Protein backbone atom coordinates (compact mmCIF):
# COMPACT_ATOMS: atom_id res chain seq x y z
CA UNK A 1 0.00 0.00 0.00
CA UNK A 2 1.25 3.42 -1.08
CA UNK A 3 0.24 6.77 0.44
CA UNK A 4 -1.99 9.13 -1.55
CA UNK A 5 -2.96 6.89 -4.48
CA UNK A 6 0.59 6.04 -5.59
CA UNK A 7 1.23 2.72 -7.31
CA UNK A 8 3.64 0.64 -9.38
CA UNK A 9 3.40 -2.16 -11.93
CA UNK A 10 3.00 -4.98 -9.40
CA UNK A 11 -0.09 -3.38 -7.85
CA UNK A 12 -1.71 -3.04 -11.28
CA UNK A 13 -0.92 -6.67 -12.12
CA UNK A 14 -2.39 -7.80 -8.79
CA UNK A 15 -5.53 -5.73 -9.35
CA UNK A 16 -5.82 -7.39 -12.76
CA UNK A 17 -5.45 -10.94 -11.40
CA UNK A 18 -8.02 -10.14 -8.71
CA UNK A 19 -10.59 -10.34 -11.52
CA UNK A 20 -9.47 -13.90 -12.28
CA UNK A 21 -9.74 -14.84 -8.61
CA UNK A 22 -13.21 -13.28 -8.40
CA UNK A 23 -14.49 -15.17 -11.45
CA UNK A 24 -13.07 -18.43 -10.08
CA UNK A 25 -14.80 -17.93 -6.73
CA UNK A 26 -18.09 -16.90 -8.38
CA UNK A 27 -18.04 -20.00 -10.60
CA UNK A 28 -17.36 -22.15 -7.54
CA UNK A 29 -20.24 -20.54 -5.63
CA UNK A 30 -22.65 -20.98 -8.55
CA UNK A 31 -21.68 -24.64 -8.94
CA UNK A 32 -22.05 -25.31 -5.21
CA UNK A 33 -25.42 -23.51 -5.11
CA UNK A 34 -26.98 -25.34 -8.07
CA UNK A 35 -26.14 -28.53 -6.16
CA UNK A 36 -28.40 -27.40 -3.30
CA UNK A 37 -30.17 -24.13 -2.51
CA UNK A 38 -25.56 -22.20 2.13
CA UNK A 39 -26.99 -23.13 5.52
CA UNK A 40 -23.51 -24.19 6.65
CA UNK A 41 -21.62 -21.78 8.89
CA UNK A 42 -18.46 -21.80 6.76
CA UNK A 43 -20.23 -21.63 3.38
CA UNK A 44 -22.19 -18.48 4.22
CA UNK A 45 -18.82 -16.81 4.85
CA UNK A 46 -17.62 -17.77 1.37
CA UNK A 47 -20.88 -16.50 -0.12
CA UNK A 48 -20.69 -13.10 1.58
CA UNK A 49 -16.99 -12.86 0.67
CA UNK A 50 -17.76 -13.44 -3.01
CA UNK A 51 -20.76 -11.10 -3.07
CA UNK A 52 -18.82 -8.29 -1.37
CA UNK A 53 -15.97 -8.88 -3.81
CA UNK A 54 -18.34 -8.54 -6.76
CA UNK A 55 -19.86 -5.40 -5.24
CA UNK A 56 -16.43 -3.84 -4.71
CA UNK A 57 -15.30 -4.77 -8.23
CA UNK A 58 -18.37 -3.25 -9.90
CA UNK A 59 -18.11 -0.12 -7.73
CA UNK A 60 -14.41 0.27 -8.59
CA UNK A 61 -15.16 -0.14 -12.30
CA UNK A 62 -18.20 2.19 -12.25
CA UNK A 63 -17.37 5.12 -9.94
CA UNK A 64 -13.91 5.54 -11.46
CA UNK A 65 -14.81 4.78 -0.51
CA UNK A 66 -14.52 1.70 -2.74
CA UNK A 67 -11.02 0.81 -1.54
CA UNK A 68 -12.16 0.51 2.08
CA UNK A 69 -14.77 -2.05 0.98
CA UNK A 70 -12.12 -4.53 -0.21
CA UNK A 71 -10.83 -4.98 3.34
CA UNK A 72 -13.06 -8.06 3.15
CA UNK A 73 -10.28 -9.74 1.14
CA UNK A 74 -8.47 -10.51 4.41
CA UNK A 75 -11.24 -13.01 5.20
CA UNK A 76 -10.18 -15.24 2.29
CA UNK A 77 -7.26 -16.88 4.19
CA UNK A 78 -9.76 -17.90 6.88
CA UNK A 79 -11.55 -20.00 4.26
CA UNK A 80 -8.34 -22.06 4.09
CA UNK A 81 -9.33 -23.43 7.51
CA UNK A 82 -12.58 -24.86 6.14
CA UNK A 83 -10.73 -26.79 3.44
CA UNK A 84 -9.03 -29.19 5.87
CA UNK A 85 -11.02 -30.65 8.81
CA UNK A 86 -7.79 -31.23 10.76
CA UNK A 87 -7.51 -27.49 11.41
CA UNK A 88 -11.29 -27.20 11.74
CA UNK A 89 -11.49 -29.53 14.74
CA UNK A 90 -8.67 -27.74 16.56
CA UNK A 91 -10.28 -24.36 15.80
CA UNK A 92 -13.56 -25.61 17.27
CA UNK A 93 -11.66 -26.90 20.31
CA UNK A 94 -10.10 -23.45 20.75
CA UNK A 95 -13.48 -21.72 20.37
CA UNK A 96 -15.36 -24.00 22.79
CA UNK A 97 -13.11 -22.82 25.65
CA UNK A 98 -14.47 -19.27 25.28
CA UNK A 99 -17.83 -20.11 26.89
CA UNK A 100 -16.53 -20.45 30.50
CA UNK A 101 -14.65 -17.13 30.19
CA UNK A 102 -17.79 -15.14 29.36
CA UNK A 103 -18.29 -14.53 33.09
CA UNK A 104 -14.73 -13.17 33.30
CA UNK A 105 -15.46 -10.95 30.29
CA UNK A 106 -18.63 -9.61 31.94
CA UNK A 107 -16.73 -8.93 35.17
CA UNK A 108 -14.03 -7.07 33.24
CA UNK A 109 -16.68 -5.01 31.44
CA UNK A 110 -18.39 -4.11 34.73
CA UNK A 111 -15.16 -3.11 36.49
CA UNK A 112 -14.07 -1.10 33.44
CA UNK A 113 -17.41 0.74 33.41
CA UNK A 114 -17.27 1.45 37.15
CA UNK A 115 -13.69 2.71 37.03
CA UNK A 116 -14.40 4.80 33.93
CA UNK A 117 -17.29 6.52 35.71
CA UNK A 118 -15.21 7.03 38.88
CA UNK A 119 -12.33 8.52 36.90
CA UNK A 120 -14.82 10.69 35.02
CA UNK A 121 -16.01 12.09 38.36
CA UNK A 122 -12.47 12.57 39.68
CA UNK A 123 -10.35 13.80 36.75
CA UNK A 124 -12.77 15.86 34.66
CA UNK A 125 -10.80 17.89 32.14
CA UNK A 126 -8.01 18.69 34.60
CA UNK A 127 -5.33 17.64 32.07
CA UNK A 128 -5.50 20.82 30.00
CA UNK A 129 -3.04 23.25 31.66
CA UNK A 130 0.65 23.38 30.75
CA UNK A 131 3.56 25.81 30.98
CA UNK A 132 3.96 28.33 28.14
CA UNK A 133 7.40 29.94 28.17
CA UNK A 134 6.63 32.26 25.25
CA UNK A 135 4.58 35.38 26.03
CA UNK A 136 1.48 33.89 24.45
CA UNK A 137 0.28 30.55 23.05
CA UNK A 138 2.44 29.74 20.02
CA UNK A 139 4.22 26.37 20.24
CA UNK A 140 3.74 25.32 23.92
CA UNK A 141 7.40 25.95 24.84
CA UNK A 142 7.73 23.12 27.39
CA UNK A 143 10.63 20.85 26.39
CA UNK A 144 9.67 18.24 23.77
CA UNK A 145 6.80 16.32 25.43
CA UNK A 146 4.88 18.75 27.66
CA UNK A 147 3.30 17.55 30.89
CA UNK A 148 0.14 18.88 32.56
CA UNK A 149 0.55 21.46 35.31
CA UNK A 150 -1.59 23.17 37.94
CA UNK A 151 -2.14 26.77 38.97
CA UNK A 152 -0.70 28.32 42.13
CA UNK A 153 -3.85 27.56 44.14
CA UNK A 154 -3.69 23.95 42.93
CA UNK A 155 -1.73 21.09 44.47
CA UNK A 156 -0.26 19.78 41.21
CA UNK A 157 3.06 20.58 39.54
CA UNK A 158 4.10 24.23 39.16
CA UNK A 159 6.98 25.05 36.81
CA UNK A 160 9.27 27.24 38.94
CA UNK A 161 10.85 28.92 35.93
CA UNK A 162 10.29 31.91 33.67
CA UNK A 163 7.21 30.17 32.26
CA UNK A 164 3.61 30.32 33.48
CA UNK A 165 0.79 27.78 33.59
CA UNK A 166 -1.91 28.64 31.05
CA UNK A 167 -4.90 26.56 29.86
CA UNK A 168 -5.82 25.79 26.26
CA UNK A 169 -3.95 22.51 25.80
CA UNK A 170 -5.16 19.56 23.74
CA UNK A 171 -3.92 16.89 26.13
CA UNK A 172 -1.00 14.61 26.98
CA UNK A 173 -1.10 12.21 24.01
CA UNK A 174 -2.53 14.68 21.48
CA UNK A 175 -5.70 14.77 23.57
CA UNK A 176 -6.32 11.02 23.38
CA UNK A 177 -5.50 9.99 26.97
CA UNK A 178 -7.84 11.82 29.36
CA UNK A 179 -11.09 11.32 31.26
CA UNK A 180 -12.93 14.05 29.35
CA UNK A 181 -16.05 12.00 28.57
CA UNK A 182 -17.22 8.39 28.80
CA UNK A 183 -15.51 7.05 25.67
CA UNK A 184 -12.13 8.62 26.43
CA UNK A 185 -12.32 7.52 30.08
CA UNK A 186 -13.25 3.96 29.11
CA UNK A 187 -10.39 3.76 26.61
CA UNK A 188 -7.95 5.11 29.20
CA UNK A 189 -9.19 2.63 31.82
CA UNK A 190 -8.80 -0.26 29.37
CA UNK A 191 -5.30 0.86 28.37
CA UNK A 192 -4.41 1.03 32.08
CA UNK A 193 -5.99 -2.36 32.87
CA UNK A 194 -3.86 -3.97 30.15
CA UNK A 195 -0.92 -2.78 32.30
CA UNK A 196 0.68 -0.96 29.35
CA UNK A 197 1.63 2.62 30.16
CA UNK A 198 -0.50 2.98 33.28
CA UNK A 199 2.33 4.85 35.00
CA UNK A 200 2.19 7.50 32.27
CA UNK A 201 -1.46 8.21 33.12
CA UNK A 202 -0.66 8.05 36.84
CA UNK A 203 2.14 10.61 36.51
CA UNK A 204 0.06 12.89 34.28
CA UNK A 205 -2.68 12.87 36.92
CA UNK A 206 -0.04 13.38 39.64
CA UNK A 207 1.07 16.51 37.76
CA UNK A 208 -2.42 17.86 37.01
CA UNK A 209 -3.71 17.19 40.55
CA UNK A 210 -1.97 16.42 43.83
CA UNK A 211 0.36 13.46 44.22
CA UNK A 212 -1.13 12.02 47.43
CA UNK A 213 -4.70 10.99 46.53
CA UNK A 214 -4.80 9.56 42.98
CA UNK A 215 -2.42 6.62 43.52
CA UNK A 216 -5.27 4.69 45.14
CA UNK A 217 -7.29 4.75 41.92
CA UNK A 218 -4.58 3.32 39.69
CA UNK A 219 -3.09 0.88 42.21
CA UNK A 220 -6.50 -0.59 43.05
Amino acid sequence: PFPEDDSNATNSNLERVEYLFLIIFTVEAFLKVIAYGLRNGWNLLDFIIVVVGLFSAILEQATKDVKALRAFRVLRPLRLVSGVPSLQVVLNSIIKAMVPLLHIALLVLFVIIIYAIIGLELFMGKMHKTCYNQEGIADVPAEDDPSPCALETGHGRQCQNGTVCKPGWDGPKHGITNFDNFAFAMLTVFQCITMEGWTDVLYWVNDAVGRDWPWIYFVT
Binding site: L106, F110, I114, I117
Partner: peptide
Protein backbone atom coordinates in the same frame (compact mmCIF):
# COMPACT_ATOMS: atom_id res chain seq x y z
CA UNK B 1 -16.14 21.14 47.80
CA UNK B 2 -15.59 17.42 48.45
CA UNK B 3 -16.34 14.64 45.96
CA UNK B 4 -15.77 11.57 48.15
CA UNK B 5 -19.48 10.93 48.72
CA UNK B 6 -20.46 11.38 45.06
CA UNK B 7 -18.56 8.20 44.17
CA UNK B 8 -20.92 6.29 46.47
CA UNK B 9 -23.65 6.86 43.88
CA UNK B 10 -21.68 4.73 41.42
CA UNK B 11 -21.14 1.85 43.84
CA UNK B 12 -24.79 0.75 43.68
CA UNK B 13 -24.04 -0.66 40.22
CA UNK B 14 -22.09 -3.49 41.86
CA UNK B 15 -25.44 -4.83 43.08
CA UNK B 16 -26.11 -5.78 39.45
CA UNK B 17 -23.23 -8.25 39.83
CA UNK B 18 -25.32 -10.21 42.36
CA UNK B 19 -27.87 -11.43 39.83
CA UNK B 20 -26.16 -14.17 37.81
CA UNK B 21 -25.71 -17.37 39.79
CA UNK B 22 -22.58 -18.56 37.99
CA UNK B 23 -20.61 -15.32 38.16
CA UNK B 24 -21.64 -14.67 41.77
CA UNK B 25 -20.60 -18.18 42.82
CA UNK B 26 -17.29 -17.90 40.94
CA UNK B 27 -16.48 -14.54 42.54
CA UNK B 28 -17.46 -15.71 46.02
CA UNK B 29 -15.46 -18.94 45.77
CA UNK B 30 -12.34 -17.11 44.55
Amino acid sequence: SITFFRLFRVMRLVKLLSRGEGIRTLLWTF
